[PDB]
Design a protein around this nucleic acid. Structure first.
Ligand code: GTP
Ligand code: MG
Ligand code: ZN
Lengths: 72, 265, 90, 750, 26, 81, 71
RNA sequence: AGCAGCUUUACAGAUCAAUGGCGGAGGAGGUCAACAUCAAGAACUGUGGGCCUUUUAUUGCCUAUAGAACUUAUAACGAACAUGGUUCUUGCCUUUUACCAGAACCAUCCGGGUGUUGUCUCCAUGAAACAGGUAAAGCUGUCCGUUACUGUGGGCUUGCCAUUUUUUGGAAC
């Protein structure tokens, strides 16, 4: 239950993980959302989880925008 | 079971059949479920544009229906009065709104979440688009909730039923009356909506002209007279000089060619 | 009036009944409703009683019964001895 | 051309009950409830009234097959031509219905269906003034938006009871596709938002204060209603209440036992989900996708309802509505909630005091009534009246005092009213008026003949004798909530038609309570309204129904106000009495804008505002957000009244552009004099102008608050729009939980 | 964006040349 | 059942009770219960021997009520439908 | 419950079984209509000479209450 | 589920006179026909009572009651959509036709719903006999079957699921 790292990993690779393993990816989302909606989170964690939901809601690639990206 | 009979006047289909017809119709069926799509792009706003001699983008153009105060030194210029405002609030933004028909104000913002995309995604799911929601006594042991006998909340056809439920007419219905093949206006929906792509000028002009004809038909109805009497073919059939038979359509067309040729010659 | 031998109170709605109470009075009226306690609703109810002055005539005949017109009346079931049919519905 | 109204007695729809019995309710005050249906735009108020109207009537002539099947709403109360074409309510309408609760006890209920658009907040204010209880209908998707907060606050201030109708639950099931557990979390979130504004008064589904509904699909229910219909028969009667109270919150059930935590290895949902939401979802799911045979047997076995052979042929939406209407029946649980929630013994006295003045109860033998507004109803002009005391009979002579005079008469009374005849009385019926011979305390009724004696609202009374006349109370002018700041100037196209316009403007001024219509000194007419839709509606009424003449109008304008940003640089006197001015403190401006003895007032000023000892005593008047301060007292006290009058004239037409002065404190610094009064007033006005001009005069513009509901990906577009509108700013962005929407709050100059 | 019907990118469902389921001139 | 619903429907009308003690109370029905406990207001009490006394309010235990006379206009209240 | 809330802390006169009368301040009540009285007094006739103060706490059993009158 | 009540379309047993209850003496279709009706105070007929009109024939209004198919509220048989005439104002023009395109007032045309009756096709055919009556009939005489009590089954109620406000006695003298 080290959500602070799960959130950080998901921001960066979740959008590819959703193309490659949509089964486990949507399990990790149903787990992460159950936490957000039903658990007594600490604020600094909570606002980073909610910001991961904003990311999925509107631009799921926006977690890997700012990195250096060499073309394929 | 599916049709009233060989007179072919009424139909009644089951959910999986309607679903299959709706699915086969995707290239020609109507996809705009949100009524707000037509804001300032509907029959009444076109009537207002015509009456006001104002032409909104992509809308039809018509001949004008009609041929100290508000001087610029006394007017406070803050925002230009767009033509869209003149049709949105035609009484407020026009001094002489003659022949204006007040439009429908608005419809609640649509929140229909879309589906049928991934074969095994259920009917009920928390779509990525939704915001999260981040906020002794005893009874008989056999007491249970209503409908507990049914374990399956979502049935195999539930997604289709919800999709058909939101679809525009006629896929919204499971029964109905037959219509003439010529009364199915397949292409009409395309020009009643905004052009789906940035097409060439000649295409956009065709869209506008088709809309113009539609608006004129809506503005000037020609009601049929209730006097159904003396219809031609029924009148002729009553005489001994006309007989009936069944033939191939191509044979009938060739006969009509030969007959018309004889008449004119 | 003669009524069917299988008749329960549930059948006697709109019939005119004589309802006899434990204090010696009778209530006559069209039955509108009844309850598991035998609470009764009598429409257009009239009460009759035999005054103590006239009661001696009943000992081993014309009796001048006193009447009150009540109207729509609720009888509480514990006060009721028995009920008798007087008349059929209209 | 103006309304769909039943003009013929013969065609008035027959009620299912006897109307003579309902009228026999009316002589009992405690068997009448006045219910105001309020809530945001399109929340479903008129549809809820459609349910009550259809329950109450045998056959409605105006009901098409499309409406009976449920393809389109009846919109019975939206019978105006404008309301039909625009698709929203514009005017207050209502109906008097005999409603039975779950114990079959009937009451007369006067329902008032108020418009939801913020532009028509004046009609909502009338509904609040007229009602005992209000049903706040909330759209479950958007939830407690800012307009819901305002309606809740306004209801508390008006001393009405509340019940909340969480409407459009079908959108959770069919539109959003939320799974039932997340729909429960959404409902719980909504209720928690509701409770955050209701002060300490808790609102909960187990208290029946929350009613769940889908007016489109014809159903409403409360937990008590649902239990009595379908669960009470399976459990001991002595346990029904204990069961009902456990159908909400963190309660879990398994095998006849309840727990505050989920049972081990069971993973079931809370009791509300298991006993209420899941079966509702199953009703939706099965009616839409289950085979009619199996469904018919399920509905017979569980709900004991029998589908007719015709119903089996219905199309999906009509069939779903039909099934839901069979299961949920009539609006009995909503009536039961209404009727238990209102308690007159703890609300009615506070209401009557709030709407008039605190004091003694009105004698039972004297007629007293509040003339709420005048309505253009059924092709005639009527007055909406609530009888507060006595009996009003057809043909009675009554005294109608225009409520603008109430303050004057109140002051004169503590130390002549137009008389007119009640030519007709009638109950509200939405599309008909049912005539009655008299009206009792507690009724809301339409009266004809008195509407000529007043403009906005009035007090109707008929004192028995000069003794009781001492105790007569006069109703205050209704607080229309919003202030009309959207402005347009107009004049007739043809001058010959100016008198027709005058008559039409008088009608508008009477039919549109919140409108302010004034003839300016240049001869052009000014109309102030709540917004662009408000103006568009009244202009349509002028051109199409009341004036029937062509009218030239200006582009939209706004009501400015004049103020000062710094103290006056010099004590300049005037002649034809020097006055000075200062920028009023923000705190006092705000509290005066919300309308919140000489020694008491001096305490207020000294403790919260810190004014000095003299200022806290020498305040002569408070007017339109301004203050006059007098700082030998006998030398000045001779003309206090005339000085005040001059100040009143100055504050409504300032020196910059004769616009209202606002937010300034004026202090009288000297007097120029020892038949004299004629000079004192105009000179004091001139002094105020100088007092302002000698400061740093500034112009103030009204700022609209804006509530934007939008899909969340489009928030950049709203951002750009706000950037492109001068002086507009975004102050908040709430996520609407469980939906794709955002609520974006900001400000825009009018 | 990938077409829901045929997976190929470049066109939406309504524009798909494959039946719904579940070189050019110079 | 219906008799109790009828009594709760008489609320606010003038009703006349007779008690087991023989006394008669006529007054406006303020409140009623499934027990038939009733509250009356502005009440004329007739002693069984004929004495008449006025009382501002009376609460009567339902077990002591013999019969209740309600107004006849209740005969077509919705409860009977 | 008997809805006796109106009567709390007020004087009441209870006509109880056996043609007896008791006056007292209603201190509380019960589902059975049992009541507690402060300052209770037995009432015998009109003359106060025949009335008798009862005690500090008096409990009256609910089936014994025929009626109560507000005072 | 068992027990209890109500109800009776079926089966069994008992009964089987009368009387009562219940049910009955074609069905589905047709690119068949005729007739009627389909845009209006939101705007429908009839039976009953009152007034007016009407002058022997019925109209209008008020009141009481019964039924109101189809069509319609972002108004309309038609989720569709042509043409013509007259007048006005325009366009291109070189005169008319043929035309431009806005309006107003009117028509035609291609189609549609519902009701009633007839007809046509296919399939069926314990009582379809005889007589009266009606616009007609499932109306009357008449005929046939079943039913009344019990058992089993079906449907409904949702009662059971002696301790202060009802029904396991403050009554009796
Ligand atoms: N999905 C859904 N739509 C509804 C429901 N109730 C009403 N609507 C729709 O919402 C729109 C507005 O409904 P109204 O009943 O007029 O709402 P309203 O509250 O009276 O609106 P205003 O008075 O104008 O503010 C209509 O299109 C209704 O069909 C509902 O329960 N579910
Ligand atoms: Mg509305
Ligand atoms: Zn494709």
């Amino acid at each position: 239950n080290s959500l602070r790292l799960v959130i950080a990993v998901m921001k960066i690779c979740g959008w590819k993980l959703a193309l490659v393993s949509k089964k486990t990816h949507d399990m990790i989302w149903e787990k992460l959302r159950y936490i957000l909606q039903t658990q007594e989170l600490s604020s600094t964690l909570r606002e980073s989880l909610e910001t991961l939901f904003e990311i999925r809601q509107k631009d799921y690639k926006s977690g890997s925008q700012g990195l250096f990206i060499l073309d394929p | 079971k599916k049709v009233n009979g060989t007179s072919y006047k009424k139909w009644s289909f089951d959910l999986p059949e309607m679903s299959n017809l709706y699915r086969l119709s995707t290239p020609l069926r109507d996809e705009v479920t949100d009524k707000n799509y037509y804001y300032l792009f509907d029959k009444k706003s076109f009537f207002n544009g015509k009456a006001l001699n104002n032409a909104i983008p992509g809308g039809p153009k018509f001949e004008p229906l009609y041929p100290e105060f508000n001087s610029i030194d006394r007017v406070i210029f803050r925002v230009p009065i767009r033509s869209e405002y003149k049709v949105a609030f035609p009484h407020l933004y026009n001094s002489r709104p003659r022949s204006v028909r007040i439009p429908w104000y608005n419809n609640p913002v649509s929140c229909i979440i879309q589906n049928d995309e991934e074969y095994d995604t259920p009917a009920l799911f928390f779509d990525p688009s939704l915001n999260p929601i981040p906020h002794d006594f005893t009874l008989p042991e056999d007491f249970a909730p209503l409908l507990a006998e049914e374990e399956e909340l979502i049935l195999p056809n539930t997604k289709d039923a919800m999709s058909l439920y939101h679809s525009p007419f006629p896929f919204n219905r499971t029964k109905g009356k037959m219509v003439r093949a010529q009364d199915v206006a397949l292409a009409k929906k395309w020009f009643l909506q905004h052009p789906d792509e940035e097409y060439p000028v000649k295409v956009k002009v065709s869209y506008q002209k088709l809309l113009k004809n539609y608006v004129l038909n809506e503005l000037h109805p020609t009601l049929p007279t209730n006097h159904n009497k003396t219809k031609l073919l029924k009148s002729l059939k009553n005489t001994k000089y006309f007989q009936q038979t069944t033939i191939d359509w191509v044979e009938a067309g060739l006969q009509l060619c030969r007959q018309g040729h004889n008449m004119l010659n | 009036i003669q009524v069917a031998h299988s008749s329960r109170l549930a059948n006697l709605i709109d019939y005119k009944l004589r309802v006899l109470t434990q204090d010696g009075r009778v209530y006559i009226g069209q039955l509108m409703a009844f309850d598991k306690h035998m609470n009764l609703v009598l429409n257009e109810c009239i009460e009759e009683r035999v005054p103590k002055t006239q009661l001696d005539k009943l000992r081993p005949l014309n009796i001048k019964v006193e009447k009150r017109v009540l109207g729509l009346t609720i009888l509480r079931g514990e006060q009721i001895l028995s009920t008798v049919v007087e008349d059929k519905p209209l | 051309e103006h309304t769909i109204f039943t003009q013929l007695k013969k065609n008035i729809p027959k009620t299912r009950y006897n109307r003579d019995y309902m009228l026999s309710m009316a002589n009992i005050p405690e068997r009448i409830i006045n219910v105001g249906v309020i809530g945001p735009l399109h929340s479903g108020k008129t549809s809820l009234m459609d349910l009550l109207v259809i329950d109450s009537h045998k056959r409605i002539p105006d009901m098409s097959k499309n409406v009976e099947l449920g393809w389109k709403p009846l919109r019975y109360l939206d019978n105006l031509k404008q309301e039909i074409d625009r698709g929203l309510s514009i005017k207050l309408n209502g109906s008097t219905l005999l409603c039975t609760d779950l114990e079959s006890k009937s009451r007369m209920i006067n329902f008032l269906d108020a418009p939801g658009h913020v532009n028509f907040m004046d009609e909502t204010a009338v509904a609040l003034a007229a009602s005992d209880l209000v049903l706040i209908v909330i759209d479950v998707v958007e939830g407690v938006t800012f307009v819901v907060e305002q309606l809740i606050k306004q209801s508390i201030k008006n001393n009405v009871a509340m019940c909340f109708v969480i409407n459009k639950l079908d959108r959770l099931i069919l539109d959003l596709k939320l799974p039932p557990m997340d729909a429960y979390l959404k409902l719980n979130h909504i209720i928690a938002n509701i409770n955050s504004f209701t002060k300490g008064n808790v609102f909960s589904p187990i208290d029946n204060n929350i009613i769940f509904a889908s007016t489109k699909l014809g159903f409403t229910f409360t937990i008590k209603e649902f239990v009595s219909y379908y669960y009470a028969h399976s459990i001991p009667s002595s346990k029904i209440d204990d069961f009902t109270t456990r159908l909400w919150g963190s309660v879990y059930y398994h095998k006849g036992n309840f727990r505050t935590k989920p049972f081990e290895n069971v993973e079931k949902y809370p009791t509300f989900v298991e006993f209420i939401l899941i079966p509702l979802y199953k009703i939706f799911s099965y009616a839409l996708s289950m085979e009619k045979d199996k469904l018919k047997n399920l509905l017979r076995s569980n709900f004991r309802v029998n589908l007719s052979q015709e119903a089996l042929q219905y199309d999906p939406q009509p069939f779903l509505k039909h099934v839901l209407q069979l299961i949920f029946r009539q609006q009995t649980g909503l009536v039961d909630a209404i009727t238990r929630c209102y308690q007159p013994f703890e609300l009615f006295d506070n209401k009557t005091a709030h709407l008039s003045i605190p004091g003694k109860s009105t004698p039972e033998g004297t007629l007293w009534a509040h003339v709420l507004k005048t309505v253009d109803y059924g092709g005639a002009e009527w007055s909406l009246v609530r009888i507060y005391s006595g009996l009003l009979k057809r043909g009675d002579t009554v005294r109608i005092l225009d409520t603008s005079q109430s303050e004057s008469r109140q002051k004169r009374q503590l130390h002549e009213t137009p008389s007119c005849e009640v030519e007709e009385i009638g109950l509200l019926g939405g599309r008909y008026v049912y005539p009655v011979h008299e009206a009792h305390k507690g009724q809301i009724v339409l009266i004809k003949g008195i509407s000529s004696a007043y403009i906005k609202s009035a007090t109707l009374y008929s004192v028995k004798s000069k003794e009781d006349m001492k105790q007569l109370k006069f109703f205050k002018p209704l607080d229309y909530i919003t202030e009309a700041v959207f402005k347009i100037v107009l004049q007739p196209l043809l001058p010959r038609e100016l008198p027709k316009l005058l008559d039409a403007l008088n009608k508008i001024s009477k039919y549109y309570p919140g409108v302010i219509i004034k003839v300016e000194e240049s001869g052009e007419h000014v109309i102030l309204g709540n917004g662009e839709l408000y103006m568009d509606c009244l202009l349509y009424d002028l051109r199409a129904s009341y004036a029937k003449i062509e009218i030239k109008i200006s582009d939209p304008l706004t009501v400015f106000s004049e103020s000062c940003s710094n103290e006056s640089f010099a004590s300049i006197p005037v002649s034809n009495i020097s006055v000075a001015a200062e920028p009023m403190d923000s705190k006092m401006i705000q509290d005066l804008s919300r309308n919140t003895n000489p020694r008491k007032l001096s305490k207020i000023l000294r403790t919260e505002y810190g004014w000095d000892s003299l200022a806290s005593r020498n305040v002569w008047s408070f007017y339109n957000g301004n203050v006059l301060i007098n700082d030998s007292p006998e030398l000045l006290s001779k003309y206090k009244e005339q000085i005040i009058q001059g100040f009143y004239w100055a504050v409504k037409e300032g020196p910059l552009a004769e616009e209202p002065i606002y937010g300034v404190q004026y202090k009288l610094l000297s007097i120029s004099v020892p038949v004299m009064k004629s000079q004192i007033i105009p000179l004091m006005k001139k002094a105020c102008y100088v007092g302002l001009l000698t400061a740093i005069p500034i112009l103030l513009e009204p700022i609209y608050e804006v509530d934007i509901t939008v899909h969340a990906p489009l928030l950049p577009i709203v951002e750009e729009l706000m950037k492109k509108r001068r002086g507009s700013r975004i102050y908040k962005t709430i996520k609407v939980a469980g939906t794709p929407l955002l609520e974006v709050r900001g400000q825009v100059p009018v | 964006s990938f077409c829901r019907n045929c997976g190929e990118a470049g066109h939406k469902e309504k524009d798909c040349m494959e039946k719904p389921r579940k070189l050019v001139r110079a | 059942g219906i008799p109790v619903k009828l009594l709760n429907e008489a609320q606010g009308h003038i009703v006349s009770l007779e008690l087991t003690t023989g006394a008669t109370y006529r007054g406006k029905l303020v409140e009623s219960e499934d027990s038939m406990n009733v509250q009356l207001r502005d009440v004329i009490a007739t002693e069984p021997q004929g004495a008449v006394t006025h009382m501002d309010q009376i609460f009567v235990r339902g077990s002591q009520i013999k019969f209740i006379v309600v107004p006849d206009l209740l005969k077509n209240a919705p409860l009977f439908k | 419950t008997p809805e006796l809330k109106k009567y709390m802390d007020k004087k009441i006169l209870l006509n109880i079984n056996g043609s007896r009368k008791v006056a007292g301040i209603l201190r509380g009540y019960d589902i059975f209509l049992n009541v507690v009285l402060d300052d209770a007094m037995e009432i015998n006739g009109e003359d106060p000479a025949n009335n008798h103060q009862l005690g500090l706490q008096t409990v009256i059993r609910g089936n014994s209450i025929i009626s109560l009158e507000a005072l």
